[PDB]
């Protein structure tokens, strides 16, 4: 009945947005200024062939000291690598099979893992005894977890199946604030370093940037036609890079409310499965379904270099959170630290 209004209003609203966005669209000076500060060739060598895993590594999350690197494999094991010595601080067996996400808490006292169980296991990495006792197996997911990230060490946002990316209180195990509005499964989840917005990438190829306190979607960025693989927020809390099954990665800026720049090369038709920003943010490390990864100059839209030396897809990238080197968690069961 009344929907006839609601659609047309929406129809014109998007129109207005287009009119606004096209109004905000100016020439990107970054591609114009490809003469300023040339990055030239970039050549890196792997210096840590952390080979404890024996199955495809799915996610990592560097510690908040860039020393304790939690990397998960779908067999059901977490390795908290000591990246400085190639030693395993912990090898943790998971009851859930086919884990895809591991979130490292800001304190290095909790870890989060989500698998094909609809359960977000939160493991206390240290107790009085020293053994790794599970703190809370968060239940309440109506779909499969794909990515999770801590906000506090007692509050956690997750990205789950069936249009759910709710925010959970760890203590109760209850999702305090259920965020809804996506039309598909929510795979990616990137947090702003402002700890006020989380951008959820769903199967509808649209990155919905959400407020974190109550239900309200800040923006609905859309440049992709394919479901989003990974989102990396800029270290400035103002823009984020987004990858998908298309060979195109896209940079979405909050202030411009539109795609600031595109990252695609006919040379590579493989979908960018992983995106990661450098310490400066000048470079953009892109992992590929192709059996090696590459690096763009994120303000030149050109391949700054290639990191090769794998034989299976690099399904996740990690960068030290002060910027020193890059972990490449491939499906070859190795993690390589290119420095």
């Amino acid at each position: 009945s009344e929907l006839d209004q609601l659609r047309q209003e929406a129809e014109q609203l998007k129109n207005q947005i287009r009119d606004a966005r096209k109004a905000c669209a100016d020439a990107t000076l970054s591609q114009i200024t490809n003469n300023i500060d040339p990055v030239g060739r970039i050549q890196m060598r792997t210096r840590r062939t952390l080979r404890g895993h024996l199955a495809k590594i799915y996610a990592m999350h560097w510690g908040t000291d860039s020393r304790l690197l939690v990397s998960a494999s779908q067999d059901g094991k977490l390795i908290i690598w000591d990246s400085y010595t190639t030693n395993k601080v912990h090898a943790i067996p998971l009851r859930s099979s086919w884990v895809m996400t591991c979130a490292y808490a800001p304190s290095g006292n909790y870890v989060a893992c989500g698998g094909l169980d609809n359960i977000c296991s939160i493991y206390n990495l240290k107790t009085r005894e020293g053994n790794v006792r599970v703190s809370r197996e968060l239940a309440g997911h109506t779909g499969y977890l794909s990515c999770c990230r801590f906000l506090d060490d007692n509050q956690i946002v997750t990205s789950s199946g069936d249009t759910t990316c709710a925010l959970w209180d760890i203590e109760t195990g209850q999702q305090t604030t259920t965020f809804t509005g996506h039309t598909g499964d929510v795979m990616s989840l990137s947090l702003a370093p402002d700890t006020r917005l989380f951008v959820s990438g769903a199967c509808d190829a649209s990155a919905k940037l959400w407020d974190v306190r109550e239900g309200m979607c800040r923006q609905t960025f859309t440049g992709h036609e394919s479901d989003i693989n990974a989102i990396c927020f800029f270290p400035n809390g103002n823009a984020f890079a987004t990858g998908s099954d298309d060979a195109t990665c896209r940079l979405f800026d909050l202030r411009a409310d539109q795609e600031l720049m595109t990252y695609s090369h006919d040379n590579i038709i493989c979908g960018i499965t992983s995106v990661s920003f450098s310490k400066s943010g000048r470079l953009l490390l892109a992992g590929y379904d192709d059996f090696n990864c590459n690096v763009w100059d994120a303000l030149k839209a050109d391949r700054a270099g290639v990191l090769a030396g794998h034989d299976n897809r690099v399904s996740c990238l990690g960068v030290t959170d002060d910027g020193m080197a890059v972990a490449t968690g491939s499906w070859d069961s190795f993690l390589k630290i290119w420095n």
Partner: protein, 63 residues
Amino acid sequence: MASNNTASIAQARKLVEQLKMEANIDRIKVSKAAADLMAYCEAHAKEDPLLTPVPASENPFRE
């Protein structure tokens, strides 16, 4: 009315609501935002070891 595609009024209402404030969010042109980003990156280029190779005794992956 929940016989109208199982109460689509709520989902359409929140769709319109979410579409509302996108316009009221600031619109700052692409060139200026790009200039801000290059200023940040070039200013921080010296403190990114990826763009600034650093000695073996001050990086934890050759020490």
